[PDB]
Design a binder for this molecule. Structure first.
Ligand SMILES: Nc1ncnc2c1ncn2[C@@H]1O[C@H](COP(=O)(O)OP(=O)(O)O)[C@@H](O)[C@H]1O
Ligand SMILES: Nc1ncnc2c1ncn2[C@@H]1O[C@H](COP(=O)(O)OP(=O)(O)O)[C@@H](O)[C@H]1O
Ligand SMILES: Nc1ncnc2c1ncn2[C@@H]1O[C@H](COP(=O)(O)OP(=O)(O)O)[C@@H](O)[C@H]1O
Ligand SMILES: [Mg+2]
Ligand SMILES: [Mg+2]
Ligand SMILES: [Mg+2]
Lengths: 528, 528, 528
């Protein structure tokens, strides 16, 4: 429809007002002494959150020109959440600091394109200094400290995450679900479990658990439905001769085939259990192949030339124990050759880099976890689901930060890392080509102080005095906003993932630099 | 509905007001010191653009009479983007200058139709002088300079585009897509790649990369589905005793045929791979014939008289090497006669001259690139999506300008080319048939100074002083707005494609000349 | 009532908007090619003026915050008109230039109080250089040129004013009144005339022109009413045997005294005339004393000790000729000694410095003109009243400028004087204490170019090109906007009073400097 066009300061003033409104709301949640933000939901039960990205995504302004500024800052938080899962409040605070400091130079008449080029030059220098300052996260104590800090000083969340990563290793998958009790509990699933139950209660061999337990069983992988007994009889006779139990993993076992199994179970002639093949579509085939590789067998399929009638014991997978519950079954550990298992894991991890869908690599990682790792479930305990949603966001934030810690390392928290990186970059000789680029560098140098300033401001102290004292110190020296005292940030456990710090600065600079270079602003005009 | 009618000056002022509003918004982005324009999107994430056509297309005015002026100037940039892909801001600036200068003569009682005839006469003379001033773009250094200027003084974009054109040649195709890293990367695909993967993972011969490499294989081109085995056996036997691998390019290979190929792969009897035929509809037939010509084979089809059962080794295509990945295969080098390949390329380029849809020659050029060239992919690296879109537009603009540079040549940039062409045209005796036509010539003579004036105005200097100094100079002498220094434009790297300059002037003159001849305007009346 | 308070840039943008609105209206009248402004009057007959002060005084804005800015610029023009009577448009233009240039430095974060201090420092230096450039106005040709320029290139007005100043000298008084003809006419009144007619038509001695001429008469000065014949008889008898006529200057001659004079005139016994004493209150006494000093007589008053009954011939004033018309009488030349006349003139000129009212010094100058000079009346000729008012304002401007020219000298016009003074001041080492004061100096250096820029802009040429050419010249070299050519401005007759140029700059700097220091604006809130 009709468009309203704003120029020069009338457009920048509207843009900055939208930037400030969104960032001020996100500001309140920053730091250990940051406070919660309540966001109304259409379906009732307002959410309480301390996450910057959650607050940013819910902000829309009636003024369309102000809304444009808010939408661009919302991009900073959204990108930081996507790439790091943490630091969205820090990224939003940094973006507002760059805009606030950059608009002073834009009003001073300097070329904003050179300011943006100077901003990029300074951010590149500071990010390189962050890499040098960063230290690897090797000890599980550091993992707990990183998780504790990112969970808003919750030691229980940090400890349970450190235990989860210890149990499932680096290749494991950790998820967060609602708990039933009031306390956090960690459930670790070892081996391969594909969450499929038996097709008949008569497969159960012990009533105290209602779980079909098979000791040293054969595993039959089939990619087609099984209904008649004629084709399944030849393999049944072989496993009957051996005496070992048989686990039939196929799309479905019904009619004569299912009936025959339950008869042999009741009379004790042959113990067996049947489960549905996990997953739908091609994912069902992929996990079926993984089970065959893990169990040392081959999936029987006419697409590969194998037939159920001609299937032999060598084509069947093996294990020492599998237990089938009402809705899940776990192969404790397959009998396949570990070299082939490692090769299969290598193939998936190579293909992981090519994954595009967000659910794609998530489902590919659980396959790797099922193969050569474990799956940990952290069940969050809370009295009410409004507290459960708040705690789950904190647990998920701590999981993202701890994952980023093992990837790129850790740096001192409380905004100290940006200050230390800034001083190193300046000492190295950071400079611009023209005075406008030098001003752009000075924008970033002042802006990196903002995360510490807003942390201190939320704590109720004077940001300028604290920042000056921190700059006087060297190394990991910093300010603990939780206790209001200075000290070695690493010793007091205030740790930040360097990936989160680097991502927050890079995302903030890219968007805030563009917002400095705006002269005209076009939005749809109001409906009178 | 009801129409409101405006006459004489009352109509012209409304028309000019719409011209000025659109052109002023586009003005802000002109030159190296031009600034960005933010346009709000309905779905959030406002776009930040420096392109004139992008800004112009989003401008609509509440006043319907002012909207006509905006709509008519808007399509000056639309036509310039269509034919050159660059210079849309220059075209919009030129169109406003002609309207502004022409309205003075219309208000002076001069015949606007003779003004339009004089404008056309002057533009024809200036365009001819642009051809004489233009110099061919031979060196790759000039290509980098042209790309750097069009990417808003970004040497990385200019250098990567120059490398891309060097690798793929004049007949190659270069595309721009999003990157995953923060840096621009160039991926060059040589030979023929048709972005289709294998039909079965068992075709993989090396698990390190999950790829299927066939060395000196036969290629079977089939335009019909393959499902049974009795037809594929005669050609499979012929492939078998030769020892070379076989690549089957058909619509689909399922059932018995797929199983037989998979079975022989595991047993090692005969190594082969099967891929789906690329393309849909008649386009699938076209590239299948191209593959047959490239590989020195014939597509087996009952529509031509060939049969799969009667297919022989001579009918099969050959290549030195082909690799089949999960989603694409690349024929490294076909065995076809280069004379036939050149003839095939000649036929397609003839069809290119006749293509009527935008995707028609685009796919036709892709076929030519697959045959006798290469496909280069520039992955733009940016931290956020908003910066990614802005960078991609700059890379696309630089690609269009470099293509225009090799097509028609280069001229000194910064509005110098129009000034030099104007002086040459005046010195050649440019005159009209009557004083009204002479005024139309004087409109264009003043208008061509506007691109330099607006570049200098955005740079903050005095346009009239700079223009006078530039006119005092000769040849490539000009003003560098980036550095604020006078000098040789070609030596300083400020290069412009002569096609972009010619297209901008011709499109601006055609529309702005018509706008001078308007005496009555008719629009739908407002709803009270 | 309730007050609305604005801060920072919101307050400044409203202040500047009011400044620009008033100055843009005044801009249109600047220079030889400036155009008229029509102002609505409540009682009909709109005034057409080219005066900056007249246009500025009529401008009031609905926005109270914008009105505050307009009221301060209106103050610049009012002060310039008060002290110089010309240069009000130049002062308004200079004030806007300082505000426009100074707002850029205020927006750059510089201290505006130091900007004001730098502005004052630069203006002091430039005014000093204006004194050196200024040359005295000693020739009547220069007076005509100064009057011609200030009358908007009207040679007739300049010539008639030059003639008027020649006739009445430097001590004379020139006034402007409406004329009955279509051409300007100059009426010079020599000697003492106090615009008082005879008391009876029988005093007329020649009916051709209805005037009463007395040759070598005695003058009787009386400060009290004369009604009875008894007191007037002793003096009347004394002048009877002398044979000379008698002029009686008293407040009133009525009753027996008036009748006796009429009877003696009719019978020819004693020729006489009687007039009212000019002026009211103490001004009547002062002018009566001046007449006595001029005529060499004494004022017969009981307040000094003299009595009408004891009045003698030596106490009576004398003159060689006096003529009494219906409403005025002129003493051709008094018989008093020049030494006492000059002493009386010196006393009044000393009192002139002490005058506290505008009419106070105006009437004092009239007394001095009556004593030792002349009174010239310029009757402006015009066809209509609207043209008469426009012409009268131009004549008053030329009168004010010519008076300023003889006081302080003349400088090259067209804004050249400010440019030459700026170059001399910079070459002399004009500098500030701190960089903020240096910026304040740079404000004035750019601002003094504005009068030439707006003169050229009204002429339709390019201001920046002309200014550069003028600056590259030296001395009186400048641009003639009337003829559009460069040359010696003194030779071409474009002259300006250095008092007008100095007053315009000083008044503009004082107000515009304060406007830069604005942070908060308090105005009455709208009444809703
Ligand atoms: N006890 C503490 N003392 C000082 N700083 C702390 C402390 N705990 C956390 N921080 C800092 O606060 C930041 C976490 O605030 P948070 O609201 O999580 O921001 P974000 O979600 O953007 O990471 C971290 O950068 C960390 O350095
Ligand atoms: N450093 C420079 N100095 C002077 N002129 C330049 C410089 N860089 C680019 N230009 C000029 O600016 C113009 C580029 O305008 P641009 O903002 O890209 O819009 P468009 O591409 O629509 O013309 C070109 O004509 C070029 O000649
Ligand atoms: N022929 C001319 N060429 C150039 N400048 C001129 C000419 N005539 C007048 N001027 C300049 O124009 C100014 C007069 O403009 P005017 O509207 O009278 O302004 P103001 O009333 O404020 O003095 C003078 O300063 C004079 O120097
Ligand atoms: Mg956090
Ligand atoms: Mg361009
Ligand atoms: Mg004047």
């Amino acid at each position: 429809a009709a468009k309203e066009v704003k120029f020069h300061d009338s457009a920048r003033e509207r843009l900055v007002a939208g930037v400030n409104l969104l960032a001020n709301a996100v500001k309140t949640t920053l730091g250990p002494k940051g406070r919660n933000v309540v966001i109304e939901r259409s379906f009732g039960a307002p959410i309480v959150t301390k996450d910057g990205v959650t607050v940013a995504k819910e902000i829309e302004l009636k003024d369309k020109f102000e809304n444009m500024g808010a939408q661009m800052v919302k991009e900073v938080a959204s990108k930081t959440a996507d790439v790091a899962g943490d630091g969205t409040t820090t990224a939003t605070v940094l973006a507002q600091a760059i805009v606030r400091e950059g608009m002073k130079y834009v009003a001073a008449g300097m070329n904003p394109m050179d300011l943006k080029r100077g901003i990029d030059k300074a951010v590149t220098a500071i990010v390189e200094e962050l890499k040098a300052i960063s230290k690897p996260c090797s000890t599980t104590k550091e993992i707990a400290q990183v998780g504790t800090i990112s969970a808003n000083a919750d030691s229980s969340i940090g400890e349970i995450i450190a235990q989860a990563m210890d149990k499932v290793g680096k290749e494991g998958v950790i998820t967060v679900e609602d708990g039933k009790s009031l306390e956090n509990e960690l459930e670790v699933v070892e081996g391969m479990q594909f969450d499929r139950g038996y097709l008949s209660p008569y497969f159960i061999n012990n009533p105290d658990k209602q779980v079909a337990v098979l000791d040293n069983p054969y595993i039959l992988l089939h990619d087609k439905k099984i209904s008649n007994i004629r084709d399944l009889l030849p393999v049944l006779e072989q496993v009957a001769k051996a005496g070992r139990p048989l686990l039939i993993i196929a799309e479905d076992v019904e009619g004569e085939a299912l009936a025959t199994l339950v008869v042999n179970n009741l009379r004790g002639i042959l113990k067996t259990c049947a489960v549905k093949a996990p997953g739908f579509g091609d994912r069902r085939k992929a996990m079926l192949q993984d089970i065959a590789i893990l169990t040392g067998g081959t999936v029987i399929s006419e697409e590969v030339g194998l037939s159920l009638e001609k299937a032999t014991l060598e084509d069947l997978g093996q294990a020492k124990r599998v237990e089938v519950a009402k809705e899940h079954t776990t192969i404790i550990d397959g009998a396949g050759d570990p070299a082939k298992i490692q090769a299969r894991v290598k193939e998936i991890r190579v293909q992981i880099e090519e994954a595009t869908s967000d659910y794609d690599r998530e489902k590919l990682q659980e396959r790797v976890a099922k193969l050569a790792g474990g799956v940990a479930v952290i069940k969050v305990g809370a009295a009410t689901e409004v507290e459960m949603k708040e705690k789950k966001a904190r647990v998920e934030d701590a999981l993202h930060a701890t994952r980023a810690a093992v990837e790129e390392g850790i740096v001192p928290g409380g905004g100290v890392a940006l200050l230390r990186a800034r001083e190193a970059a300046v000492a190295k000789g950071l400079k611009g080509d023209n005075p406008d680029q030098e001003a752009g560098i000075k924008i970033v140098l002042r802006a990196v102080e903002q995360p510490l300033r807003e942390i201190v401001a939320n704590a109720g102290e004077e940001p300028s005095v604290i920042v000056a004292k921190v700059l006087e110190g060297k190394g990991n020296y910093g300010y603990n906003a939780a206790t209001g005292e200075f000290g070695d940030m690493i010793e007091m456990g205030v740790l930040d993932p360097t990936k989160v710090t680097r991502s927050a600065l890079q995302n903030a600079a890219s968007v805030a630099g563009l917002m400095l270079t705006t002269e005209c602003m076009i939005a749809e005009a109001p409906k009178d």
